[PDB]
Design a protein around this ligand. Structure first.
Ligand SMILES: CN1Cc2cccnc2C1=O
Ligand SMILES: CN1Cc2cccnc2C1=O
Lengths: 229, 229
């Protein structure tokens, strides 16, 4: 019995001006934009209560997509940083009838290769967790720590090192307090787990697939061109 | 004035039997095998004294390549592990007239995107180094350390964490002693830097390009299909 969950897709930071170097979320991935394929990983799930995309109010690419005329996709105003945009998504969820104890999933707009297995695996393993968790994969490259002189001080034991992926799964109320307080404190928030970690909580690690990659360079598109359907 | 250097390409571990899931070094990369493109990064360098490929004596793919009939490529017998094959490559270099103080470069057979810039940058920055070093790139993914309960114990400060790449550049005599003694000691050697680290030396880090990737899955080929010429 998988739990019910809301979904927040932070996708702001896009300028008002179309550019030849398009935002990675609007690149073409086998006939569709990256963010459209990212939304498909969630929109069809029976336990989905509602999905909210965080966007700049002057985003020139979004009104061209068919998901902009979709009742299954809600929109929230972007913030100054990613954490602020996630915060506005949490406020938008509260307007749609979300409760403080509802599960919320935050997922990168440029991670379109999220499989149904990883999603349900994350949902079934955290459904009874006291704080939540996130998808992650073990580090497979040799890690080396540097001293101040640029020389190797040690080879890090990567058997305990995991790469942080998305989605990340936390309770709406707790994440709301953690994100808002950490922004007031001046914390260098990266993901939602870092805000929960600063607040004292230890998120659970849920192993996911390694090909759930984030599109950071247009060369990373080439890895996923054969991944659909 | 770049220093003179020998090159060892460990490429053993290949079985005697051709298989449909070919060894990654023999996959096609825009009309040529991965290992052929890897050798091209070195064979044309004016400071190259000699290149040695470590191969199993029953390798069914190598005799089909034109580099098997090339005077510019020498061959050494593979060992039981990668470190042993590297060791036999060092012995093969000594037969070709190498000296104990000569620079040796060890590079992965499945890293064909090594640019001339990274190679010379590694050579010019380590030419006067007391031990040597290796190419590396800074970690750009969020790193999380796991406790014994599978929960995040800390987010690792990745400002001091580097991913270890190749080539790696060490003196022939020192690497020979470090590799041989560490194998006798029972050390879990990964790369040459780990053997030098166990021997007490601190290798220098030389920043290289991030697209000098190792081909571990046939999906990684897709990243490099547009990288040549
Ligand atoms: C994914 N991102 C990046 C960013 C920068 C600034 C404001 N919002 C955002 C957001 O949602
Ligand atoms: C690159 N590799 C892997 C391996 C396994 C066993 C023996 N030699 C080798 C070698 O050179």
């Amino acid at each position: 019995d998988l739990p019910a969950f809301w979904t927040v897709i932070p996708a702001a930071g896009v300028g008002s001006r179309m550019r030849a170097d398009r935002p990675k979320q609007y690149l073409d991935l086998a006939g569709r934009t990256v963010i459209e394929r990212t939304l498909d990983c969630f929109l069809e799930h029976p336990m989905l209560r509602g999905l909210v995309v965080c966007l700049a109010e002057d985003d020139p690419y979004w009104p061209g997509l068919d998901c902009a005329a979709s009742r299954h996709v809600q929109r929230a105003a972007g913030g100054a940083e990613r954490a602020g945009s996630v915060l506005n998504g949490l406020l938008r969820l509260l307007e749609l009838g979300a409760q403080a104890d509802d599960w919320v999933l935050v997922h990168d707009a440029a991670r379109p290769n999220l499989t149904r297995g990883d999603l349900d695996r994350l949902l079934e393993e955290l459904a009874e967790d006291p704080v939540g968790g996130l998808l992650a994969v073990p580090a497979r490259d040799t890690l080396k720590r540097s001293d101040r002189d640029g020389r190797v001080s040690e080879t890090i034991d990567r058997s305990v090192v995991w790469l942080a992926y998305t989605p990340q799964m936390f309770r709406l109320g707790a994440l709301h307090r953690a994100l808002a307080d950490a922004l007031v404190a001046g914390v260098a928030i990266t993901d939602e787990a870092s805000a929960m970690e600063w607040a004292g909580y230890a998120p659970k690690l849920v192993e996911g697939r390694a090909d759930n990659l984030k599109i950071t360079t247009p060369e990373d598109l080439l890895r996923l061109q054969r991944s659909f359907p």
